[PDB]
Every structure is written in structure tokens, then in C-alpha cells.
Design a protein around this nucleic acid. Structure first.
Length: 112
RNA sequence: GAAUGUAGUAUGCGGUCCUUGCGGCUGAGA
């Protein structure tokens, strides 16, 4: 088995533990990713806080992706109204709007 | 040696312009 420890303060430690086990719903992806980092420990006597390490605490990679997308999908309404406002911002200035699909995979901000 | 008063350092002024979080790495070994 594995042991998961959270470097966050008390109370919030238990709440984040409940959040990661899908016991309680999470609506903000940035918050759970950043301020609720799980330190998954493998058979080694260390707590690796890497994305590969935190992948282990799930059933598999597909469960990880589904959980992340479900967390993202909860905020769909607020993001929709925000996108409507942003599009209204575009229409104010005489701007040109075009839409393109990701032909291949895309990753921005890999180096932060 | 004798015999002040009256008075806003104020009026106008965008910490802005130019800068890809990029570079490199076999989900493989039997």
C-alpha cells in the first residue's frame, strides 16, 4: 500500500484528504492542484510530490484524467458566463476573432 | 528727554514602452 501526507496545516489537511479521495466535491482545479498537493509515498521511505507519484493514489491514469475533468466540469456555468463577458469585451474594440482547433497536443507554461 | 492687518505651493501630468516559461529527455526493459 501507500501513505499520503499533506504539508498543509491542520483541519485543512483532513479536508484535502477527503477531497482527494473523491469524498467531497471540488470545484476549483487550480486550488486543489496547487494548495492541496498530495505527497504520495511509494515503497521508498520518502514522500515524492510529483505528478507521477500523485498518479499512483488513483486507480489508474484514466481515473486521474476523469477526476481532473470532472473537477473542471463543475465550474462550467461560471466559466461560461466569464467567456460570454470576455467575448463581449472582444466586440467592443474593432477586433478580429478567429477560432482554431488543436491539431496536435498543446502545453503552455511547462516551466513555471 | 518723554511719546500690523489680509494670504491654500497651488494649477495641468496614466510607472509607461519593448520581452513566447521557453530548452533537452523512448512508457520503455525481459
Amino acid at each position: 500500500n501507500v501513505v499520503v501526507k499533506y504539508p498543509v496545516n491542520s483541519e485543512l489537511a483532513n479536508y484535502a484528504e477527503k477531497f482527494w479521495k473523491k469524498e467531497l466535491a471540488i470545484y476549483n482545479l487550480s486550488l486543489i492542484l496547487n494548495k492541496m498537493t498530495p505527497f504520495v509515498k511509494r515503497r521508498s521511505e520518502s514522500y515524492k510530490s510529483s505528478l507521477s507519484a500523485v498518479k499512483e493514489i488513483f486507480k489508474n491514469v484514466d481515473d486521474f484524467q476523469n477526476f481532473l475533468n470532472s473537477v473542471l466540469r463543475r465550474s462550467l456555468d461560471e466559466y461560461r458566463v466569464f467567456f460570454e463577458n470576455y467575448e463581449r469585451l472582444f466586440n467592443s474594440f474593432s477586433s478580429k476573432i478567429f477560432s482554431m482547433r488543436t491539431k496536435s497536443r498543446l502545453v503552455v507554461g511547462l516551466g513555471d
